[PDB]
């Protein structure tokens with residue numbers, strides 16, 4: 001009961017940061033962590049926007065799942081970004097360059113319309129189609145991120161069933177003890193204070209879907225693993241894993 005949520009508050013505390021974890025089962029949401037006010041606070045989606053970025057591109061034939069985005073050879077911030085990748089490969093590695101290319105294919109006209117049509121966050125993408133999710137006006141609360149993941153998990157987003165099933169496969173991580181796990185990590189360092197994301201959902205053995213969105217403040221020098229660690233540890237303590 002209230003004891004399960006006391007360890008979660010310590011999990012964010014032992015990481016020396018303030019964060020929240022939103023869990024949605026059915027149409028009900030529950031928040032955990034040390035800064036519960038974060039659940040209703042808007043932050044830049046960062047790489048979590050790639051979920052919707054891929055849905056728009058595939059639905060409007062801007063790209064395909066087998067298309068290969070060749071690396072130009074210029075040095076990148078991460079070594080995993082220095083390779084030719086399909087849209088799916090770029091999703092796991094969080095290759096900003098590939099989805100900036102896709103965003104330029106979609107264009108500000110279609111990008112802004114589709115974001116508003118789905119109702120993603122504040123639905124304000126500004127005028128630059130290649131950076132609105134990292135620093136731009138686009139902001140979203142962790143509650144809206146978990147609600148988005150739950151709808152994508154059940155394929156109830158306003159996109160074709162084919163496209164939703166393709167983006168789902170891009171986000172598949174692992175199957176831990178019979179539970180299939182889908183998630184998309186995010187890290188917006190170009191906003192102060194920095195924000196850390198981990199949005200996804202769990203497909204339990206009987207098919208039940210449990211969506212989640214971890215949101216914490218990416219402090220200076222904090223390890224990027226903390227997002228995945230707190231999320232996995234929390235779901236285990238919540239009986240979901």
Ligand SMILES: *C(=O)[C@@H]([C@@H]1NC(C(=O)O)=C(S[C@@H]2CN[C@H](CNS(N)(=O)=O)C2)[C@@H]1C)[C@@H](C)O
Pocket residue numbers: 046047048078080092093094095096185186187188224
């Ligand atoms: C989006 O948030 C941002 C990307 N995305 C991420 C992220 O949180 O995954 C990072 S951090 C870095 C990227 N690649 C590593 C994880 N993928 S991996 N291990 O290679 O499979 C960690 C970075 C800030 C924007 C720039 O896309």
